[PDB]
Design a protein around this nucleic acid. Structure first.
Lengths: 121, 104, 203, 204
RNA sequence: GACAUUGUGAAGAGUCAGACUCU
RNA sequence: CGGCACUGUUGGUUCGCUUGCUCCUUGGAGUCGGGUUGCUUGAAAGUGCAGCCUAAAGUGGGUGAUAAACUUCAUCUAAGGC
RNA sequence: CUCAACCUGAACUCAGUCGUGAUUACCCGCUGAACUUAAGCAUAUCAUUUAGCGGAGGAAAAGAAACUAAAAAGGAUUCCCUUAGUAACGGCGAGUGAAACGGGAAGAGCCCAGCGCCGAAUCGAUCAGUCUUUGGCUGCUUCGAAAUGUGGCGUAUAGGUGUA
């Protein structure tokens, strides 16, 4: 399958996902993202009993969540994983972000992005 | 018309037992079919992304050559119905006009 | 939402992008078994609108079905009858390929319940469907008061009785004069009613 | 071999009819069973009417029957609004709601609005908690005369009345009824041809 | 024989007005 | 053994519901439809079902039982479920 | 090349589940004859039926209109009477053959996807308490599912915001 994906001709809208952010820019992007990771499990544990005794800025994730933010022009930066399979889930985001003048980049790693969000992918 | 000897007509253009008409209000179920603004944006963006089908491209070539009858016959054969063929031909003619204005 | 975009994109199956994706996927599917468990739906929005939830107990299988007519299984095309029954080749099955695929999935997986299915690919020889099934004994299903219906004995093997959406399409159910042949819920029931001789008590 | 003057036979007995035979020996048994079911339902839902929901008045559809009325499926939302009854409230106080029917004529709407009004007049509402009544609930001695109603709720009357004799008016006699009917038929039949002629005349 | 599976390039010929058709 | 009705108690649960005004909003695709083939129907220029080819739209789509354009309308809202 | 993710795919006498096979009267999906009638016979008829295969229940299936119709209109499904041996089909031969309106039995309505808002507010195992323990309730128990999206509002009668 890997060989076939190279042998066949790829249409531009599918090929746009092959060219991703370079290593340095990706490192900068992940450095910025890591400053607003969601609440940890240990943080949740420590906060739960304090609240029982008694929402900052965070990276948002999810195509439907991100799609709404882009359409409302509320997102400042959008990062799209390059290996989303099925690809139709994110096939519209690059064109949608560009239609609403929202900066976007295809970054490498749906798993890397999942780590930022304390998820799998 | 009601009057001497006539209380209503059972035949003709004005047949019908007399009755008073309430003002007509559209039922909710009738609203299905109207494109929302967001749906129109979605369809236009998806058109931009995906592009055209092979028969659509053939029809575009015919319309550029200005063979409207040939395009209509081809669309009747492919889409199947005269109504749908007319609709698709009109949409593709609009595409041709937009392309002309944009480029030239 | 993104789901509307997925739906509209999937409506354009002749576009270059979806043609490329379908070509790759069809090649991949042709190399697997006829019935094969799939980790996740290939069309999450289609599955969602057919009734799928990303919850424990919902499973997806891919079924490959051979295309074409149904050849009459007789030796050397020998029917032994009147000429009206000599047809061997241009005979079409009563159930659609999708219904056959759901039936195969349900037969193989006897402990699950077929919920629905959808089209994912096809070439000149095969049609590929993905069947969404439910495990009626997982507690995540039994405790949810909305999926409890499929956990009742009266829904055993819906695809074998033609109750799924694909199955019902072949039964000719509907309202109006175009569908009057199935009054009572089945053509067989209606035929029995119309062809029974009624002897009233006092006549 | 039919012989002589006979009506040609028509009996549809050429199928294996012996496999599909239905007798009616259980007709009285079914009657008894349905009576017992009604009695059980009445005991279950007393003092509510045994028939169940109140149904609406309806004109029979086609011109062969349009001079007759009958019980409908329910009351349209327009009728409920005209009678000042919420749909939610109607479901609770036992009034059938027809969510498909709509009213296009004031007379039809008004008949059902009046029907709803008389049903509300005849209604007896028990307090939600017997200890504590509220507003709208029926009064104490009203709740004593409560009895289960059998048969249709507000049954319809099918008696036929005769218009009072009157005087034959001169204008009535001077009308040409047959000529009028034939004129109406001709006008409807030739409407389109005359429009075509008018369009051609305009074009010339 | 036609259509689909059926993709990526060249050369020739023919249509048009960069497309199509064939070989 | 059940069914009820009322009392008490236990556990959970209730920022809701109706009508007016106000502004906003509103939908299922290899599906529908079309060609052809076969079966089926009382369904007759195709009632229902299916194979292959084709393949949508968005006041759009279906239907109004004689096929087609162009017109008056009327009536529903398919391709998900109990 | 080291480590760590994800994706895909495995092995387990891993922890705990579930399916298989019977029954025939009725029920649901398929497959599918010929005898016979036509005074022959091939379409037709028998018959969308014997026979064959699969799948349930106490009933099943159907079911809340992409309906009927053309009134001053009816209004889910199922069943009965009537329509009616009628319209229609048919080597227009032999034969076949409904439905709506009408009168009744019974009557009960609803939930999603999508759009939008809250946005993980949702859920399974395991551990510990506790009870009326062949199962339930409580959690800083520990794991996992879930952003390729679980839950809440909400579905054509619409719905939602604010307001009285």
């Amino acid at each position: 399958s890997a060989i076939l994906q190279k042998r066949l001709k790829v249409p531009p809208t599918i090929n746009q996902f092959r060219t991703a952010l370079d290593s340095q820019s990706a490192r900068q992007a992940f450095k910025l993202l890591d400053k607003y990771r969601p609440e940890s499990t240990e943080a949740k544990k420590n906060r739960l009993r304090a609240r029982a005794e008694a929402r900052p800025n965070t990276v948002r994730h999810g195509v439907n969540t991100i799609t709404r933010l882009v359409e409302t022009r509320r997102a400042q930066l959008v990062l799209i994983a390059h290996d989303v399979n099925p690809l139709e889930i994110v096939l519209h985001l690059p064109a949608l972000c560009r239609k609403y003048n929202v900066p976007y980049a295809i970054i490498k790693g749906k798993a890397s992005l999942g780590t930022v969000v304390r998820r799998k992918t | 018309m009601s009057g001497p000897g006539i209380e209503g007509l059972a035949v003709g253009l004005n047949k019908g037992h007399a009755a008073t008409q309430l003002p007509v209000k559209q039922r909710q179920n009738r609203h299905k079919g109207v494109a929302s603004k967001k749906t129109k944006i979605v369809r236009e963006l998806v058109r931009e992304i995906t592009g055209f089908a092979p028969y659509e491209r053939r029809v575009l070539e015919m319309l550029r050559i200005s063979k409207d009858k040939r395009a209509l016959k081809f669309l009747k054969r492919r889409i199947g119905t005269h109504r749908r063929a007319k609709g698709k031909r009109e949409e593709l003619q609009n595409v041709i006009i937009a392309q002309r204005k944009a480029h030239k | 939402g993104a789901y509307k975009y997925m739906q509209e994109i999937w409506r354009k199956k002749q576009s270059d992008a979806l043609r490329y994706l379908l070509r790759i996927r069809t090649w991949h599917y042709r190399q697997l078994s006829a019935v094969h468990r799939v980790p996740r739906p290939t069309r999450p929005e289609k599955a969602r609108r057919l009734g799928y939830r990303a919850k424990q107990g919902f499973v997806v299988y891919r079924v490959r079905v051979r295309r074409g007519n149904r050849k009459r299984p007789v030796c050397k095309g020998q029917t032994y009858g009147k000429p009206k029954t000599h047809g061997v080749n241009e005979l079409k099955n009563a159930k659609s390929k999708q219904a056959v695929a759901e039936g195969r999935a349900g037969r193989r997986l006897g402990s699950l319940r077929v919920l629905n299915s959808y089209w994912v690919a096809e070439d000149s020889t095969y049609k590929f469907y993905e069947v969404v099934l439910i495990d009626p004994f997982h507690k995540a299903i039994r405790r949810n008061p909305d999926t409890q219906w499929i956990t009742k004995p009266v829904h055993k093997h819906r695809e074998q009785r033609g109750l799924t959406s694909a199955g019902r399409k072949s039964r000719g159910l509907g309202k109006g004069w175009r569908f009057s042949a199935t009054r009572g819920g089945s053509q067989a029931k209606n035929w029995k009613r119309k062809n029974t001789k009624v002897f009233h008590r006092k006549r | 071999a039919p012989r002589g003057n006979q009506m040609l036979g028509n009996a549809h007995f050429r199928k294996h009819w012996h496999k599909r035979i239905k007798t009616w020996f259980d007709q009285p048994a079914r009657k008894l069973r349905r009576r017992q079911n009604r009695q059980a339902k009445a005991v279950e839902i007393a003092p509510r009417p045994v028939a169940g929901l109140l149904r609406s008045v309806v004109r029979c559809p086609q011109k062969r029957y349009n001079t007759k009325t009958r019980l409908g499926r329910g009351f349209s939302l327009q009728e409920l609004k005209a009678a000042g009854i919420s749909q939610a409230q109607a479901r609770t106080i036992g009034i059938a709601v027809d969510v498909r029917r709509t009213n296009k004529t004031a007379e039809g709407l008004k008949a059902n609005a009046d029907r709803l009004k008389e049903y509300k007049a005849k209604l007896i509402l028990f307090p939600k908690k017997a200890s504590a009544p509220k507003k709208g609930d029926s009064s104490a001695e009203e709740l004593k005369v409560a009895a289960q109603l059998r048969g249709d709720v507000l049954p319809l009357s099918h008696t036929i009345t005769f218009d009072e004799p009157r005087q034959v008016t001169d204008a009535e006699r001077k009308v040409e009824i047959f000529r009028l009917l034939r004129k109406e038929r001709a006008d409807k039949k030739y409407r389109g041809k005359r429009e075509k002629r008018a369009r051609e005349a305009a074009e010339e």
